[PDB]
Design an enzyme around this catalytic site. Sequence first.
Site, PDB file in Angstrom:
ATOM      1  N   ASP A  22       0.848  -1.202   0.000  1.00  0.00           N
ATOM      2  CA  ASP A  22       0.000   0.000   0.000  1.00  0.00           C
ATOM      3  C   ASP A  22       0.889   1.261   0.000  1.00  0.00           C
ATOM      4  O   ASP A  22       1.901   1.295  -0.698  1.00  0.00           O
ATOM      5  CB  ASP A  22      -0.961  -0.027   1.205  1.00  0.00           C
ATOM      6  CG  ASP A  22      -2.133   0.939   1.048  1.00  0.00           C
ATOM      7  OD1 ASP A  22      -3.111   0.611   0.327  1.00  0.00           O
ATOM      8  OD2 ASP A  22      -2.065   2.042   1.633  1.00  0.00           O
ATOM      9  N   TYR A  29      -3.219  11.530   2.694  1.00  0.00           N
ATOM     10  CA  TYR A  29      -3.685  11.540   1.307  1.00  0.00           C
ATOM     11  C   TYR A  29      -3.719  12.947   0.735  1.00  0.00           C
ATOM     12  O   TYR A  29      -3.390  13.150  -0.432  1.00  0.00           O
ATOM     13  CB  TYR A  29      -5.080  10.916   1.191  1.00  0.00           C
ATOM     14  CG  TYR A  29      -5.058   9.407   1.255  1.00  0.00           C
ATOM     15  CD1 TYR A  29      -4.870   8.643   0.111  1.00  0.00           C
ATOM     16  CD2 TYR A  29      -5.195   8.746   2.471  1.00  0.00           C
ATOM     17  CE1 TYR A  29      -4.848   7.250   0.176  1.00  0.00           C
ATOM     18  CE2 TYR A  29      -5.173   7.371   2.544  1.00  0.00           C
ATOM     19  CZ  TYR A  29      -4.997   6.627   1.404  1.00  0.00           C
ATOM     20  OH  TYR A  29      -4.984   5.264   1.493  1.00  0.00           O
ATOM     21  N   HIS A  82      -4.262  -7.945  -0.476  1.00  0.00           N
ATOM     22  CA  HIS A  82      -3.531  -6.697  -0.215  1.00  0.00           C
ATOM     23  C   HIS A  82      -2.768  -6.677   1.099  1.00  0.00           C
ATOM     24  O   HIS A  82      -1.794  -5.937   1.237  1.00  0.00           O
ATOM     25  CB  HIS A  82      -4.545  -5.562  -0.233  1.00  0.00           C
ATOM     26  CG  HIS A  82      -3.969  -4.180  -0.241  1.00  0.00           C
ATOM     27  ND1 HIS A  82      -3.452  -3.593  -1.379  1.00  0.00           N
ATOM     28  CD2 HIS A  82      -3.936  -3.224   0.722  1.00  0.00           C
ATOM     29  CE1 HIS A  82      -3.087  -2.352  -1.105  1.00  0.00           C
ATOM     30  NE2 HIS A  82      -3.381  -2.098   0.157  1.00  0.00           N
TER      31      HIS A  82
HETATM   32  O1  LIG Z   1      -4.890   2.315  -1.241  1.00  0.00           O
HETATM   33  C1  LIG Z   1      -4.305   1.649  -2.325  1.00  0.00           C
HETATM   34  C2  LIG Z   1      -3.681   2.655  -3.231  1.00  0.00           C
HETATM   35  C3  LIG Z   1      -4.037   2.067  -4.656  1.00  0.00           C
HETATM   36  C4  LIG Z   1      -3.538   2.405  -6.007  1.00  0.00           C
HETATM   37  C5  LIG Z   1      -4.028   1.710  -7.144  1.00  0.00           C
HETATM   38  C6  LIG Z   1      -5.067   0.623  -6.938  1.00  0.00           C
HETATM   39  C7  LIG Z   1      -5.525   0.311  -5.676  1.00  0.00           C
HETATM   40  C8  LIG Z   1      -5.003   1.045  -4.503  1.00  0.00           C
HETATM   41  C9  LIG Z   1      -5.320   0.932  -3.066  1.00  0.00           C
HETATM   42  O2  LIG Z   1      -5.407  -0.422  -2.659  1.00  0.00           O
END
Ligand SMILES: O[C@@H]1Cc2ccccc2[C@H]1O
Lengths: 390, 388
Positions: B175, B304, B363
């Site tokens: 992540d 973020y 994940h």
């Molecule tokens: O938070 C993550 C950041 C990201 C970036 C692209 C696809 C999925 C995700 C998420 O799982």
Amino acid sequence: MEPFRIVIPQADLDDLHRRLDATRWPSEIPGTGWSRGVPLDYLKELVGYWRDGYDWRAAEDRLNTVPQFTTEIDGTNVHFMHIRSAEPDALPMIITHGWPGSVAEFLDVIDPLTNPRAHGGDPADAFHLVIPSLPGFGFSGPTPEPGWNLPRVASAWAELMRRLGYSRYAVQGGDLGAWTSLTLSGVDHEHVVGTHVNFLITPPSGDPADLAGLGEQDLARLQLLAEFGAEGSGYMKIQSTRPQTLSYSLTDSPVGQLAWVVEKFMEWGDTDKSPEDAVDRDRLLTNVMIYWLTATAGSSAHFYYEISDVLPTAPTPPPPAPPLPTPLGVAVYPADSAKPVRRFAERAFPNIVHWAELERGGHFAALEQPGLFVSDLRAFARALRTSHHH
Amino acid sequence: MEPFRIVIPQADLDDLHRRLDATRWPSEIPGTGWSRGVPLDYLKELVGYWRDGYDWRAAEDRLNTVPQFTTEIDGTNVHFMHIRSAEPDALPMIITHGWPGSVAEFLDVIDPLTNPRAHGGDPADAFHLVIPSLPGFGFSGPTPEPGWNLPRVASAWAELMRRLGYSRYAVQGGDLGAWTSLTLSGVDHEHVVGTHVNFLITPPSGDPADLAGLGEQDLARLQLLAEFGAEGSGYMKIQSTRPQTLSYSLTDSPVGQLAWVVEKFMEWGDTDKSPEDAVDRDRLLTNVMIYWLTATAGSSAHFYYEISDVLPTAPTPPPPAPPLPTPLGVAVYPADSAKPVRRFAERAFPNIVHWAELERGGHFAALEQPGLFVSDLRAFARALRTSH
Ligand SMILES: O[C@@H]1Cc2ccccc2[C@H]1O
Ligand SMILES: O[C@@H]1Cc2ccccc2[C@H]1O
């Protein structure tokens, strides 16, 4: 079609105050103003007034001065206000709120629109008003099933006007209510005689050619759209994709419900330091109370999911529409979150009968500037009458 | 640098139970399953367990078996676990969690990584572990000022490793922890010996020619990115723009805080009908408790905002980065929310030394598949020793 009165149990108010007293406040990063959302200091002050100051019973009384009804349409409960004009040949008009608004937005424009003779208006410019709560919103409450998108809401509304006996009516709205109104003008084209929106988006083609000759203000309006997409669309992206996940925190937390909604009155209203610059705190809280008491944060969010494909947050844009032939009035409020480019509007709407650029007010026109809103809608009705017989 | 111990006041637990007891639940649209977010019947049952069966004190006890510390770096509090290997020769590695995760994710891999002799491993594959809480997250807590973006976090970590005396170390993450690790590999290139990520996005250029020859599996991985932007990015768009507005509801409502987090364990884990298919409910609630009890839903969301310019949700999609020279290991877990196309990854990272395609897990690799994760990281260590 049954009479309806708002009667909130005292237990609900006691619960609200219990929750308010127990609020757990977050940390903040100092020096960021409103740039990252509602500031802590402001919200603490507004919540203190909400808990000790705000008078729901008076708001409740005022709402109940307006004749309300409920009726079932296409499987769902539809709540609506219906106010007959004091004048015979008045124009029937259905006015639709959007998000994060409610039928409470219109309390200060109902009497001048329907009874102009008592508010210095011309009796010739009177309206009959139908002001429905969107399915999923306020006193209409949650829908029971998937599929309540723009055309399904529009068809419900057409059926409402049929039941009320209006075979010829105009449609009016801002925010999502404008989109519903435009949709309805096509869906019920046999019965709709004109459309007025105070919110209109005109996206560019994507071809750098259609920007030729546009002046600074029109280019700034297009930039506003891009800014909204980049910075202002957070609420829209989450409500259009996972409204149920969001609903748990907004239904459980009154401070959270308040912040979620009041942020938009700051950002979309004609404001400078506070949302109260444009809408006083009693009106702000009454609107939030309708969300809180009916627990419709989530059901109202599901509307965005149902219409996700036609939002600016859509992955790919919807295909270009054929022109909408409805006689159209457009009102542009200067602090609005989006404003139309008239050249583009002319292409999409070949029968514009009324166009106004107002001097003040933002996204919540009837609430922010009821005097201007009323004067504008009257001029639209006059333009409609003019366009029909010439 | 001072020892740290988690001791949650009883009053905080009493407050949590009062809130849970008083939960006001929303309506639902029946029959929509998980398609529009966390379903009502599931969350009512999980909250029931949270209230009646879940044992925070036991979770607190387990967390406190890990040596932990705090230190101030660049004006903010940084909380971290530090576990030494009994093998003095061990590879130091800093492992960074992401959102909505925490240092609790790694509880089951710590002993196997630091004491391989006792857990089916070769002493040569031992690690010293540093496992920090991201600034704004968990027991690190809120940052005091703007600007904590990826380079500033990376700099803080380089400083942490310098303070611990680690002049050569590996970096690992999934992540946002993977993005932080990749950034750190550039920022502290002198001291970083290698980088391992179990999360990697490889966006297409948009030039149709670059898709030539890709098999259906790689094409599906690219489409996974498109689907995430279209349907999965709501949490990212609101946290990257109005984190403070969001923070009020998540900080005041434990059911809200729970829904907001547990949704991702369903969508991004190797799941079927429930997030508990991949992560049992005690571990799920322990992770949520770290957000709730530290009141870091808002401050974690602000991360973020600070990095909005480099996210998928960015106003303008970030320009393709130049190639990064770090020796790179990549672990692809089959149920992950995004997965890299190897052809594209090797253009972005010309020094990939390890590439694993695992056969289970999503994940949250260390949490979901601790056995697979440990084996893969040991393999990565060996790849680093034999290539450099
Ligand atoms: O938070 C993550 C950041 C990201 C970036 C692209 C696809 C999925 C995700 C998420 O799982
Ligand atoms: O202010 C917002 C700007 C926008 C754009 C499209 C639809 C609705 C809305 C408004 O809610």
